[PDB]
Amino acid sequence: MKWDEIGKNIAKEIEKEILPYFGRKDKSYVVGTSPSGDETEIFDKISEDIALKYLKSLNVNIVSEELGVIDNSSEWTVVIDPIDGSFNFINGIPFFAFCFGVFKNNEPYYGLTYEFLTKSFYEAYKGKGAYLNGRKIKVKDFNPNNIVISYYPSKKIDLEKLRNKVKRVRIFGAFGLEMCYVAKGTLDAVFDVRPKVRAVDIASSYIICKEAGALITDENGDELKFDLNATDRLNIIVANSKEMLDIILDLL
Amino acid sequence: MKWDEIGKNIAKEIEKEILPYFGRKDKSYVVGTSPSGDETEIFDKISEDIALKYLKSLNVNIVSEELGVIDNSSEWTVVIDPIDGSFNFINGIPFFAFCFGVFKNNEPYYGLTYEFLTKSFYEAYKGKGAYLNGRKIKVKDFNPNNIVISYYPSKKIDLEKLRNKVKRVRIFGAFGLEMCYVAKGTLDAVFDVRPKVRAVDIASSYIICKEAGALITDENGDELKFDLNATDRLNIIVANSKEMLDIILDLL
Ligand SMILES: O=P([O-])([O-])O[C@@H]1[C@H](O)[C@H](O)[C@@H](O)[C@H](O)[C@H]1O
Numbered sequence: 404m405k406w407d408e409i410g411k412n413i414a415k416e417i418e419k420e421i422l423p424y425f426g427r428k429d430k431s432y433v434v435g436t437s438p439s440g441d442e443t444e445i446f447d448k449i450s451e452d453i454a455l456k457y458l459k460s461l462n463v464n465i466v467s468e469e470l471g472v473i474d475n476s477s478e479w480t481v482v483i484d485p486i487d488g489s490f491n492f493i494n495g496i497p498f499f500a501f502c503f504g505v506f507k508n509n510e511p512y513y514g515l516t517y518e519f520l521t522k523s524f525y526e527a528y529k530g531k532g533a534y535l536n537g538r539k540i541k542v543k544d545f546n547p548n549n550i551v552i553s554y555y556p557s558k559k560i561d562l563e564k565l566r567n568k569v570k571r572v573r574i575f576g577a578f579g580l581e582m583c584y585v586a587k588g589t590l591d592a593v594f595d596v597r598p599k600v601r602a603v604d605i606a607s608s609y610i611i612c613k614e615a616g617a618l619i620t621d622e623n624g625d626e627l628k629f630d631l632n633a634t635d636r637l638n639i640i641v642a643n644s645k646e647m648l649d650i651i652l653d654l655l
Numbered sequence: 656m657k658w659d660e661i662g663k664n665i666a667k668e669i670e671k672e673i674l675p676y677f678g679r680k681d682k683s684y685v686v687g688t689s690p691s692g693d694e695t696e697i698f699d700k701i702s703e704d705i706a707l708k709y710l711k712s713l714n715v716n717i718v719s720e721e722l723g724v725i726d727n728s729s730e731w732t733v734v735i736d737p738i739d740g741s742f743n744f745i746n747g748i749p750f751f752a753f754c755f756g757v758f759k760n761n762e763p764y765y766g767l768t769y770e771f772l773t774k775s776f777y778e779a780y781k782g783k784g785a786y787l788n789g790r791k792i793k794v795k796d797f798n799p800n801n802i803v804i805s806y807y808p809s810k811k812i813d814l815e816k817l818r819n820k821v822k823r824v825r826i827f828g829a830f831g832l833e834m835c836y837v838a839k840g841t842l843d844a845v846f847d848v849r850p851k852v853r854a855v856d857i858a859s860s861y862i863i864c865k866e867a868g869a870l871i872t873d874e875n876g877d878e879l880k881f882d883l884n885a886t887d888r889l890n891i892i893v894a895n896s897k898e899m900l901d902i903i904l905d906l907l
């Protein structure tokens with residue numbers, strides 16, 4: 404079947420199985436450490452294994468957080484984060500999402516980011532446009548008297564310059580999903596020059612943001628490029644306009 | 656009918672109606688100017704009117720965000736924000752909350768804070784302890800290597816030093832519900848020294864937070880005392896521990 408039908412499949416199965424853990428630290432506990440020297444909790448495992456209970460059957464290349472890279476030679480590669488923003492999850496902050504990115508020869512083909520709590524499918528086939536539960540969605544027109552943003556800054560930033568230059572701040576702690584908010588028009592931009600994000604966090608939303616009219620760029624301003632691997636953090640900037648990108652490039 | 660029942664009952668009813676406007680920024684218009692001077696959107700009005708219908712036949716005083724003060728000269732005072740987090744709400748950001756606090760003799764008696772999309776009832780009867788959906792909650796144990804905070808700084812705070820002390824940041828744009836985030840033990844603290852919150856924003860969660868064992872102070876670190884008006888904003892520091900408070904006072 405088609406990719407959106409497979410992504411949404413896995414999405415909704417992870418959903419039923421991991422939502423009762425939502426906010427219930429009493430029930431979760433560490434179960435391993437990820438190759439990235441990170442702690443894996445029981446709900447991450449459960450959610451990754453489900454996804455893998457499906458994806459292995461497709462004989463493609465799966466690429467995930469707590470598991471690194473499984474090469475099968477395919478022209479196809481699934482980049483997944485079964486749960487983006489697990490801290491929030493385990494702690495009852497309602498901002499997490501399933502991230503599933505389909506690549507055909509390392510070029511974007513299909514992207515899906517599912518926001519469990521609000522039952523929202525954000526998807527885009529490469530070249531086909533960006534949708535939110537069947538409706539097109541677009542980066543919002545720039546208004547410098549109405550900048551709303553979310554950022555992940557380094558020591559290298561003048562935060563007050565920033566705070567001065569924008570109007571609102573939101574900082575949700577799930578990069579993948581924040582990218583989708585740039586895509587749907589809520590945010591003027593999100594970024595992380597404090598290099599922590601990785602391909603498993605931005606792949607699926609990459610595609611979606613691009614088709615949304617977004618300007619995805621690196622530290623410097625040229626189009627962002629990335630390798631598919633569970634390792635490698637990367638600076639990223641996801642603004643809705645040349646102007647917006649400026650202001651942000653204007654501080655780092 | 657018990658105070659907590661009135662509160663819960665108005666919650667579920669506002670829910671019915673306003674949820675359809677969630678993120679549907681294409682479905683709402685501005686009917687006027689809350690006495691102060693901000694946009695009163697249609698859903699603001701609707702949710703308020705549903706509250707006042709139940710309250711009117713009670714003959715208690717009412718402090719409301721979009722209507723200020725109604726004095727029926729009763730010893731009972733009900734302070735409400737039908738929706739805390741408008742912006743998020745109509746921009747489809749799932750962080751907003753119904754606020755309902757009951758005071759007797761201008762002393763805390765009961766607080767409800769309803770997190771709609773989570774269907775989380777936060778509440779405390781004054782002196783009886785704070786609950787979340789029936790489970791007793793209590794602030795987070797202090798750990799200096801694991802500070803998680805939310806803040807709204809004045810144009811004076813050392814954001815640099817500030818960020819250098821804490822381990823995670825989140826800023827959600829809903830003081831009322833953010834307050835219960837300390838109450839329930841997710842954040843070490845939230846504060847607003849950019850004098851913006853009003854009574855309507857913190858009454859219900861003031862109570863809940865106190866019963867959760869939080870410290871609630873003003874800039875000087877002196878015990879917060881506030882008057883029940885829908886006017887004049889206040890500096891507030893809700894924290895989980897003295898140490899947390901101090902760190903926040905140092906950069907104040
Ligand atoms: O780890 P996770 O909770 O699955 O996802 C986290 C989010 O993408 C967050 O935005 C980023 O700053 C962290 O580095 C990630 O770890």
Ligand SMILES: O=P([O-])([O-])O[C@@H]1[C@H](O)[C@H](O)[C@@H](O)[C@H](O)[C@H]1O
Binds near residue numbers: 741851856
């Ligand atoms: O307007 P509203 O969304 O009902 O309430 C807002 C929230 O309490 C927010 O935390 C505060 O920073 C704003 O100043 C308030 O106006």
Ligand SMILES: [Ca+2]
Binds near residue numbers: 447484486489
């Ligand atoms: Ca994850």
Ligand SMILES: [Ca+2]
Binds near residue numbers: 468484488603604
């Ligand atoms: Ca992640």
Ligand SMILES: [Ca+2]
Binds near residue numbers: 738741
């Ligand atoms: Ca309000």
Ligand SMILES: [Ca+2]
Binds near residue numbers: 720736740855856
């Ligand atoms: Ca408010």
